Design a protein around this ligand. Structure first.
Ligand SMILES: *[C@@H]1O[C@H](CO)[C@@H](O)[C@H](O)[C@H]1NC(C)=O
Ligand SMILES: *[C@@H]1O[C@H](CO)[C@@H](O)[C@H](O)[C@H]1NC(C)=O
Lengths: 123, 121
């Protein structure tokens, strides 16, 4: 299953990066699982993941780091609390969990560049 | 001549970006011209330029948004006043002007990413 996500995103001054992960639905999926994985160096790690009925909001483990909104064959993701060290490749994984059959799609990754604010005088 | 510059650089939250530009060591002390070209395909435009004798300090005198330092066959270019819309490809062009021969070197371009920061109250 084709998953597309932007090649590069810049985090804002507040360390919030947002991007669109959209999937090419092979059928009519009611339940979907989205996962954000961070790749680096040769390893992959799970950042956040929402399992949602398409017709409702997404709820994450922390949800202080990821938020998301579903809107058809796509989902608006937001990653928060980013610092420079978090610069890296963020992979969007999409799973269609219901109805059968299961489909799995993995996108090419979005490079997220993050900068730390410079010092600000007092106070 | 070979000119090396980093592939990607991030501007600070102050809208300042720096990168080193390195050229192939000339056979001798030479007058060197360093030029920053912004590439906005197919737009190519001079952002700033400076000339110095090797062994002297590089110093921009064009009143551009660029300042720089020099050491050996490297120059450290600092460009200030950048905003998000200035995100793009910045090419380091280096010319060995004289004593001859004349040599031209063009780097591969540094992609500079810039964000608009929050002010601080
Ligand atoms: C999701 O992204 C679309 C554009 O792809 C945007 O128009 C829409 O406002 C976004 N939904 C939100 C902000 O929840
Ligand atoms: C390049 O110049 C900037 C601004 O002066 C400085 O912060 C940085 O340390 C310099 N980098 C190198 C490699 O000299």
């Amino acid at each position: 299953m084709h998953v597309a996500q932007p090649a590069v995103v810049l985090a804002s001054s507040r360390g919030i990066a947002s991007f669109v992960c959209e999937y090419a639905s092979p059928g009519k999926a009611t339940e979907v699982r989205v996962t954000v994985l961070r790749q680096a160096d040769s390893q992959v790690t799970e950042v956040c993941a929402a399992t949602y009925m398409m017709g409702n909001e997404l709820t994450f483990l922390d949800d202080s780091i990821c938020t998301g909104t579903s809107s058809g064959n796509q989902v608006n993701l937001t990653i928060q609390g980013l610092r420079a060290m978090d610069t890296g490749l963020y992979i969007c994984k999409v799973e269609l969990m219901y109805p059968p059959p299961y489909y799995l799609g993995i996108g090419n990754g979005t490079q997220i560049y993050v900068i730390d604010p410079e010092p600000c005088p007092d106070s």
